[PDB]
Design a protein around this nucleic acid. Structure first.
Ligand SMILES: [Zn+2]
Lengths: 99, 16, 100, 98, 175, 488
DNA sequence: TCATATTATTACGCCAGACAGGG
DNA sequence: CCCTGTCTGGCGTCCTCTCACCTATGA
């Protein structure tokens, strides 16, 4: 089975990508597993915002890396190859893995 | 380099 | 930071890049309990001979824009101050102010 | 039959042959000899570079005729470049000096 | 003692040439003048995954090996077998046997290159891998990371205007 | 623009400098779709993109980034005529000597290595061995060796001894042939002999030995190592009316050379025995020799059905090569052809020319005249006007004819009076009216004859038609002093 | 459909040009 | 060694028009 790991910072974008991937899968092949949402990584950062000194002065940023696990149960001839053509939205790292 | 072009080939052979 | 400091850092990095294979090997030799004493000694001495800037524990992480040694962050390669600026500008992807 | 400007052949950029294919009459070898036999030099130059083979030459010619400027920019026959590629595709190294 | 010889057939009718040769032997009953007839196979198995069945002409591509002796009667017999051009040797008077070591080495190499390729398949970061075994088939991509210990290749074959870095086997892809 | 054309031999570095990519696979096209083969004879990366400024597979469908080559396409990004100038090269596994320098009568490699043609072919077709700087043995350098001569020598001189065969051996011989040294020897041999026959046999060998030293042609450039392939555009693959591709003969030749070269590389991978790779290299030698000049070797190869297929040298030589069929004689635009008839009202500087032929031959002049007046605007409008043939284009036609000569030409032109320039007078009809006296120049009766009309386009050509080729100017035959406008 | 790769007829007429044979 | 039959290659008219016909194989 083809496991697909979508990773992105924007959630909407990721969602869009996932849908597209599903569409790509579903026309060619059959029995797409589904878009399973894994836990989001909220990598936080604190920094001092003064140039020199004021320690209680701080900004707390974060990067929300979202995960989408799409799986394809039956890899056909037509389906797997299709991925190459269907181009998705930018800033979405995909990671397909057969078996 | 015979007919009307003999003047052209005179010119090209002169300008080398 | 100064230009000079930056240059020095760069040099150190270069040295590290150069001498990694040898240094690592030497370290391994020194560690290896199943080895001769004399050999070990030689290795230890050999290491000394190699340049100091060849060590990776010599090089300090500075900001990639300003060269500021302190307040550094690894993910961004930038000092706090610059990082913040980047965030504000939209230049770091995904990064926004966090509240919870 | 008559032809101003029709289709062009594929391997050598010269007009097609025949009537059903809308083609032009073969200005054969003995006619080339008969124009060498006069002093007609520009007539033969446009008869085998502009009117026949050179593609940029004949598009420049068509613009120049519909604008009233009777003038030819000569260039090279493209079938001579085909001769260079066929001789060059052997072990032979033909070139163009200077 | 029967030594080996090489026969040329019309390439493609080789099994039928071998069958007709055995039958001409058992017709003209020179049974003491022929030992075997070899056509060398690699036994390719890939008719399922990727309709191609490991497209590789089973060497030799048109030559029939015959254990034989040399009389002119047996020579006329083998050249009177249909769809046979002739022997391949130094001359046509006394055509040439091969050797001993050559044949031995040939068989060994066949088996090795046969069974299942595994002999230093370190693709490495370069060239261009062509996945065909498994789902993602008929596709090309480069292998950024190579795992010889895990016997896997981290190839990022371009997909939907991007790059999908997956781990495939050496037999799943093609250099 | 350029002076003289220089011809010389092609070095393997020169053939790699011509090239744009090694043609590996023999697979021509897909044949079930429309795409070619990556990477076969008709490649993408090695040559160029079929479509103009397009990646054949998929990227760049506008005019911004002309050149980018993605990994999904392995394609350049230029013009449709860019493939016509680009050529590929086939890395021949086994060396193959040229057929033009081995069988030219006299052979170039026959009078250079001081060896008979018969013996040269024997070794070349894996039927004889040749020695090359053996050593301390009792054997010459040019002297050949047979199976029995080699077998005994093999057991005798097992050490320092070299005896190869084929083009490889030949190449070595040529490669290790001190040209300069031979010159003096040959020159001294010619001055130390009186034999008439020998003198002529020595002067013909030294002439081709000193001429090779005068130029930059090497002795090892005779054998083909990096075979060059002609541009696809020049070996076109067009389908006829139907669903199949009528393929050219050169694609059969190149596809066989590449099939055999792939087989020979695989056998040298597998370490096949001696007789297998000798037959394999011999089939490659005959395949290359059949590609270059087909049929100069024994009976020529054939595809369909028994007729031999046409090779590169047969694209050059003959009545239908490039010289006699496309470079000395060309097919010609602005030209016409019809049956002649008399029309005796003519003056002898003018001929009758039909209105339908006149409106077809003078389409651009009519377009230019129509655009000058202001009747229309764009070119399309003018082409619709003369496609409809309205009432105003005939005055345009009588104003483009008036002082514009045409070249009438009877089809077997033997002397220069068979191309003469007239002024047209328009004819209701479909037959060229030709002034009768002029007929005795053309050898033209009126029993079904046909003549071609040609239009001098440029201005120098109109003046050459009026001042040199006009029919009033040809009243004396150039063979003598007798008048050619004699009343018949 | 997608790689595999070459055999069982003769009947022109000079005219040069190269080649083994022999007095 | 200079004549010599004998064999091998290399020519053989330009232009045009009409029509039909196009590799086998194959688990
Ligand atoms: Zn592209």
């Amino acid at each position: 089975r083809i496991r697909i790991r979508l990773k992105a910072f924007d959630h909407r974008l990721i969602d869009q990508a996932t849908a597209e991937i599903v569409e790509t899968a579903k026309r060619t092949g059959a029995q797409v597993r589904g878009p399973i949402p894994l836990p989001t990584r909220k990598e936080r950062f604190t920094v001092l915002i003064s140039p020199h000194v004021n320690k209680d002065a701080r900004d707390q940023y974060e990067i929300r890396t979202h995960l989408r696990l799409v799986d394809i149960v039956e890899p056909t001839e037509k389906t797997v190859d299709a991925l190459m053509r269907l181009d998705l939205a930018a800033g979405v790292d995909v990671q397909i893995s057969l078996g | 380099p015979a007919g009307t072009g003999y003047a052209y080939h005179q010119d090209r052979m002169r300008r080398r | 930071a100064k230009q000079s400091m930056k240059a020095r850092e760069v040099k150190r990095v270069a040295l590290a890049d150069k001498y990694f294979a040898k240094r690592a090997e030497l370290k391994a030799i020194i560690s290896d309990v199943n080895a001769s004493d004399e050999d070990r000694w030689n290795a230890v001495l050999k290491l000394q001979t190699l340049p100091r800037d060849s060590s990776p524990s010599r090089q300090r992480n500075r900001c990639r824009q300003t060269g500021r040694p302190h307040g550094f962050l690894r993910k961004f390669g930038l000092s706090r101050i610059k990082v913040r600026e980047a965030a504000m500008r939209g230049e770091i992807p995904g990064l926004k102010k966090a509240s919870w | 039959h008559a032809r101003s400007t029709g289709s062009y052949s594929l391997v050598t950029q010269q007009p097609l042959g025949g009537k059903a294919q809308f083609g032009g009459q073969r200005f054969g070898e003995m006619e080339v000899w008969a124009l060498e036999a006069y002093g007609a030099a520009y007539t033969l130059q446009e008869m085998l570079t502009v009117k026949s083979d050179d593609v940029n030459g004949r598009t420049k010619m068509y613009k120049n005729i519909v604008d009233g400027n009777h003038q030819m920019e000569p260039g090279m026959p493209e079938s001579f470049n085909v001769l260079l590629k066929e001789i060059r595709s052997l072990g032979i190294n033909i070139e163009l000096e200077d | 003692k029967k030594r080996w010889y090489v026969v040329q057939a019309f390439s493609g009718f080789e099994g039928r040439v071998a069958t007709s040769l055995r039958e001409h032997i058992k017709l003209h009953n020179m049974e003491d003048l022929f030992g075997e007839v070899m056509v060398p196979t690699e036994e390719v198995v890939e008719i399922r995954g990727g309709q191609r069945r490991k497209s590789e002409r089973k060497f030799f591509p048109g030559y029939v090996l015959v254990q034989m002796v040399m009389n002119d009667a047996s020579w006329h017999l083998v050249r009177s077998v249909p769809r046979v051009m002739g022997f391949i040797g130094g001359t046509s008077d006394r055509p040439a046997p091969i050797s001993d070591k050559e044949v031995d080495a040939i068989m060994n190499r066949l088996q090795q290159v046969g069974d299942k390729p595994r002999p230093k398949t370190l693709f490495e970061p370069g060239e261009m891998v062509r996945v065909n075994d498994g789902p993602f088939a008929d596709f090309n991509g480069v292998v950024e990371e190579v795992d010889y210990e895990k016997s896997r290749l981290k190839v990022s074959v371009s997909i939907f205007g991007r790059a999908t870095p997956v781990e495939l086997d050496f037999s799943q892809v093609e250099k | 623009e350029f002076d003289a054309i220089k011809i010389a031999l092609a070095s393997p570095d020169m053939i790699r400098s011509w090239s744009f990519g090694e043609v590996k696979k023999p697979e021509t096209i897909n044949y079930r779709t429309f795409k070619p083969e990556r990477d076969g004879l008709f490649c993408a990366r090695i040559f160029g993109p079929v479509k103009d400024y397009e990646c054949l597979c998929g990227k760049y469908k506008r005019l911004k980034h002309r050149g980018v080559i993605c990994e999904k396409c392995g394609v350049e990004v230029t013009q449709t005529k860019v493939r016509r100038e680009r050529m590929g090269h086939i890395e021949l596994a086994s060396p193959t000597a040229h057929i033009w320098f081995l069988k030219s009568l006299p052979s170039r490699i026959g009078l250079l290595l001081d060896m008979p043609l018969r013996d040269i072919e024997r070794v070349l077709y894996f039927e004889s061995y040749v020695v090359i700087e053996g050593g301390m043995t009792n054997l010459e350098r040019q002297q050949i060796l047979t199976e029995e001569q080699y077998l005994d020598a093999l057991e005798e001189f097992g050490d320092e001894f070299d005896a190869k065969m084929g083009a490889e051996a030949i190449q070595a011989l040529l490669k290790s042939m001190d040209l300069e040294q031979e010159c003096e020897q040959l020159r001294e041999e010619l001055n130390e002999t009186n034999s008439e026959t020998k003198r002529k046999k020595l002067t013909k060998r030294i002439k081709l030995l000193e001429a090779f030293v005068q130029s930059g042609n090497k002795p090892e450039w005779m054998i083909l190592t990096v075979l060059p392939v002609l541009p696809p555009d020049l070996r076109p693959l067009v389908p006829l009316d139907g669903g199949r591709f009528a393929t050219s003969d050169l694609n059969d030749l190149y596809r066989r050379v590449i099939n055999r070269n792939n087989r020979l590389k695989r056998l040298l991978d597998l370490a096949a025995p001696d007789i297998i790779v000798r037959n394999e290299k011999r089939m490659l030698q005959e395949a290359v020799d059949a590609l270059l000049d087909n049929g100069r070797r024994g009976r020529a190869i054939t595809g369909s059905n028994k007729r031999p297929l046409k090779s590169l040298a047969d694209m050059i030589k003959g009545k239908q090569g490039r010289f006699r069929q496309n470079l000395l004689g060309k097919r010609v635009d602005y030209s016409g052809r019809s049956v002649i008839t008399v029309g005796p009202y003519l003056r002898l500087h003018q001929c009758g020319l039909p209105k339908k032929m006149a409106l077809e031959l003078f389409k651009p002049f009519i377009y230019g005249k129509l655009e000058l007046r202001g009747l229309a605007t764009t070119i399309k409008a003018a082409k619709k006007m003369v496609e409809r043939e309205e009432a105003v284009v005939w005055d345009i036609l009588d104003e483009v004819i008036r002082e514009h000569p045409v070249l009438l030409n009877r089809a077997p032109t033997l002397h220069r009076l068979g191309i003469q320039a007239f002024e047209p007078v328009l004819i209701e009809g479909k037959a060229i009216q030709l002034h009768p006296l002029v007929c005795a120049a053309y050898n033209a009766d009126f029993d079904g004859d046909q003549m071609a009309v040609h239009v001098p386009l440029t201005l120098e050509a109109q003046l050459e038609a009026r001042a040199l080729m006009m029919s009033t100017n040809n009243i004396l035959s150039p063979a003598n002093g007798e008048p050619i406008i004699v009343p018949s």
